[model samples]
Each structure stands twice: as structure tokens, then as C-alpha cells.
Target: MITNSGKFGVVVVGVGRAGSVRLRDLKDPRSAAFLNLIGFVSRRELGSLDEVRQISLEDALRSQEIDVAYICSESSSHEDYIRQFLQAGKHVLVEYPMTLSFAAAQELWELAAQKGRVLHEEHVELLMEEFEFLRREVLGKELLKGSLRFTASPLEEERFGFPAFSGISRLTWLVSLFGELSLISATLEERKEDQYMKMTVQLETQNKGLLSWIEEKGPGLKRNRYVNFQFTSGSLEEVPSVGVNKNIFLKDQDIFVQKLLDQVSAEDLAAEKKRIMHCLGLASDIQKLC
Candidate 1:
């Protein structure tokens, strides 16, 4: 068997917003390709780089520079690219939504099973960042419920990208900690032509908010992605970067994993799988708004 240590390189498909960002973000230690950017695939224009060779998607798949492809193409092309990459014996880290429908998600997942390659949907930043915080300091067997009004955001701020609401995994995390959601609703806000939006969701939650969960947002680095629930016992507040800070107010949580509230446990799979199963149940119960 080929060992993971020596068996792969980098390839960015689409050469668009997320692709470029991934390339540039190699500065951050989290970027998977910081040490290995071998090729880039774009349908159109290419960048000017001395060693970087631009190629077609098909060629990238056949060659060695694409052991993994970050399918950053438009939303519609995500699943197709994932399947293509896997068929070519490459791993895939495609962007959010996977597609606009749940059926498509199941399909791609099935394909991954067949190919024995990793075709993962890395869209659940909420659970990894925000909800993980509340579960630590607040959520319990019997606490209190809360209210919230967190605005929405887009995934990449481009027509080709998705909105922050696309983070079903985050919403799913809430369901895991707080239990089955009795009520969940969201109103879609879409730009007529471009499809940009400002979405808003309402979740009436209960059973945990040990910190006096107040319905609140903002007063942090990023906004609209978190919420506060006002509870009678105490309250539940989530500041994304709390996991990294030592400040008493911020409540430093899992620092090794993004230092955010969400349950992104790179350190252990046993814990991650347990949390994921719980979160997925919550996501399954989410109902769209009228």
C-alpha cells in the first residue's frame, strides 16, 4: 500500500475564488497544500507563475500533480469534479453544498464508497467553531432555552460561492447538543440575477444555555455566524475564537483545534466520529422555512 507520507501532491481545479484563496492561504499552517502546490486546472485564464504549470482538468487527473484536487469550481460542478477526481485515483475536498440537493450529496458519498477515496463535504464550520463552545461551558442535561438573531453570510462572497447558511453541519451541531429541534425556520434572501443574499434563521432552542443564553450576536472578529441564548439559569454565548484565548470572559476551549467553539477535533477520530453522528441527526431534522 502507498503510504500517505510520501504518496501525493496538490492540484487546484477551477482557479477561481476558493482556488486562489487556497493558493494564497498556504501561508497559514492549516492550508493542506502549503508544502506541495504542483499544478492548477482552470477552464479559462491562467496565472503567471514561474514553476506552476496550468493544465486542463482531464490532464491534471491523469498526471501525478493531482493526487488531490480542490474542486473550487462553481457549485454545480462540485459533484462532477469530485467523481472525476476520484475515478482518476485522486482524493477530493470540494466546496460546500456538494450540490443544492440532498440526493446529490448521497450520490457523491456513494461514489466515494465505491472509489474508496475521500470525497468529503467540508462545509460544517459552525459545529467546529461556534456550537462546540456552547456545549463545553453551557449545554447540559437540563438547563434553559434561548433566542437569537444572527444574520447570514456567503461562503466566499462571490457568485460562484455559497452563503454562510450553507453550513448545515453547524446547524446540525446545535441539534446534537440541544437535542432534537422542535422548531427551525429560515427565510431565503436572494438577489434576483446574481443570487447573493442576506439570510436569517430562527431557532427556538431549549435544555441547555448554562450561561444565561441571550439572543445576541456581534462584538467579535466575525459576525452573523454565532448567536446568544438567554436562559433563566445562566446563558449560552459563543465567540468563535474562544477556544484559543485564555481570557476568562472568552473561556478558552479546544485550542489545538482551530481554537474555535465548533467540534473540529484533528487530534482524535473517536471523539470526532461521536460528535459527528450526534450532529448529523440534528441536521436531518432541520426543516426549511415557508
Candidate 2:
């Protein structure tokens, strides 16, 4: 186990735009509790980094400097990268979509089961304090119904048939709060290669909890995202990271590092597999609808 004097060495895989943001988080002192971000993995040439190291993906897999790998690569390449890290005996923290397919996600879960190592999807929505408030104060009531909407303005080629690409975090937390969702109705729109999309899915849980999800991706759209919960007593609404001033990503890293450093029981690891598998299944569903 990594000790207090020896912080856990970390590597960020594929430092693109989103990966760069996570890189910043890794470098933040708040993460020093367990993370020692020694370097990164990227194929393309990076500008001069006098101190930080940059290496190839294969090198990262074999490097002793990395005890954990943050897979911030593209969604399509997540499964392959995640498998490599796990096979090399490193815990992983992967970005959303886990993989492009649910079958692949299940395969990854099987690896985690066999390896008995921690592999967590970066679902910051669930880690945010605002959502923490929701889970504590708003959930567990005789709720009637709720609505969730996610809107994004990515390019057409990147928009269509990729509903979970941008909205899976909300759905993951949704299931944790409301239970499994059985989709009732859905609508998908296509424009110049199915770029534009709007999917409205009505879902019901075994407890008769009703919920609606509205996901949209199109051009000329503002960065709008919101979730509403209706409990028996009253209602609560939150815009992601709107009211909070603290770095919620740090909170997320705190959760990740906790699992990385702590002694995970077999039962706890099994629960993680189930939760991630649920998220991946819903992601596949959204892709089918789109």
C-alpha cells in the first residue's frame, strides 16, 4: 500500500481538452492526499514541460512511476486503454461512456472482478455537493415524478447516436436515486447525418416512481443543463456547478483517491461493478434510441 511519505504515483492518459482539465485537477494540491501526478500519456508532441514527464501509452502501462492511470482518452478508445492499465496491475479512473458498448463494459467489469482492482468512472455529477444535497435531503421520499433534461451543442458528427456521450453522468446518479429505469417512449431526430437529436424517455421503477428524461444535441445551442426532483413534501432544482464556488472536481478526486488508497472489500468491489454496469447499460440504451 502507498504510505503517507510515499504518495500514490499517477498518470493522465491522453491529455486532450477534457483530459487537460483533469490534468489540472491532478496537479492541484487538494489531491495530494493520495495522488502524485508524476507525468502524462500522449502520442502527439506536447510543448516543453521542464519538470512533468510525457510518455507513450505503452510506456505508461509499464512505468513504475504510475500506480494509477486516469483514462481521459476519447470515449471510443476507453475500453482498450482501461484494459491495458488493469492488465498491468494499475487502478484506473476513466472518463464517461466507460466504453462505446455495454458488452465491452461488462467485459471490463469482468476484468475488475478478476483483478480485484478499483476502476471508477468519472461521474462528477454524482460527486458534486449539490447532488449530494439532493441524495440526502430530497431522495428517499414518496416521490411522485421527476424530469431531467440535458442539452449540448457539439458538432453533428459527434452528436447523433451518442446520447450517453454527454449525458451519462446524470443518468448514473438518477438510477442511484430512483432505481432502474424502464424506458417507455423515445423520439430521435436526424439532420445531415443524424447530428440533431432529441430523445424523450419516460421511465418507471419497480417502486412505481415515474421519471422523464429529455436529451438534446444540436447546433446553435447554449450550454444548458438542469435536473428537477419532485418529492412528496416539496421540490428541488439544481443547475450543475451553478451555486457552488468550490472545485467540485476536487471532491470527485477525493472520492477516487479514497477508493485507491483504502482497502476495498470484495463486497464493495462487487457493488462498484454493478453500479458501473448499470450506467453502461443505460448509455447503450441512449445510443440505441438516438
Model 1 per-residue lDDT at 215: 20
TM-score of each model, in listed order: 0.63, 0.86
Per-residue error (Å), model 1, residue 259: 20
Tell me the lDDT of model 1 at 256: 16
lDDT of model number 1: 0.52
Write model 2 residue lDDT over 1-290, tens digit each, in one string: 95454777888888887678777887777886677877888867883254677877778778886888888877767888899999898888887767878898888877976887778887777766667777786545766788888887754334222666556776777787877777766666657554576767777776777888887777777767677877788776764455763787677677787787676676876676677777677767766865
Report the lDDT tens digits of candidate 1 across residue range 1-290.
96554424667787677777655544344444323667788878665344677877768878875566777777767767777887788767766655544555566667766886655455435434454566676544354554444443334434332332245444555555565454455445655455344444455545423321112222232445445655556655555664643221111111212311224444653344344433343333332342
Clashes of 2: 0
RMSD of each: 7.6, 3.3
Question: Which of the numbered candidates is closest to the native, going by highest TM-score?
Answer: 2
Per-candidate total of colliding backbone pairs:
22, 0
- The parts of candidate 1 lying over 4 Å away from their true place are 1-5, 25-35, 47-50, 123-132, 139-143, 152-173, 179-226, 237-289
